[PDB]
Amino acid sequence: LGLFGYWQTEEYQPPVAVDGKVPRNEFGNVYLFLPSMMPIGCVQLNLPNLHRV
DNA sequence: AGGTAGTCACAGCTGATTGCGCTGAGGATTAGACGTGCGATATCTATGCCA
């Protein structure tokens, strides 16, 4: 596996939701290790069983 | 007074019902590092050998 230096990588730029569509990765999600990673126009809700609704 | 259409009492057809199966979301769940122990291994110098 080929690692890279910090100087070889730029800061991650989260997308912006367009037409009310939440972007998804290849895994069909968004990596949110940091709050800055969230795409603009998105809100995180920690409500249990909210996706059911 | 006479017969077949309107009305009521029952029959076939079919949809709803009641046991039972299956997915989708949702909440549960020892491999380079870091050292040492042992083992092979460079490493420095006393000192008397005889020319």
DSSP A1-53: -----STTSPPP---B-BTTB----TTSS---SSGGGSPBT------TTTTT-
Question: Residues 8-47 of chain A: which lie with beta carbon within 7 Å of strand B?
Answer: none
Distance A10 CA to B46 C1' (A): 67
Nucleotide at minimal C1' distance from the A52 CA: B25
Neighbours of A40 (CB within 10 A): 9
CA angle A49, A26, A14 (to 5 degrees): 80
What is the experimental resolution, given in Å to one decimal place? 4.0
Neighbours of A15 (CB within 10 A): 14
Method: cryo-EM
Cβ atoms of residues A30 and A23 within 8 Å: yes
Distance A26 CA to B27 C1' (A): 24
Instruction: Using the Cα atoms of residue A23, residue A51, residue A45 and residue A35 in order, give the sign of their dihedral.
Output: negative
Cβ atoms of residues A8 and A31 within 8 Å: no
Distance A15 CA to B7 C1' (A): 77
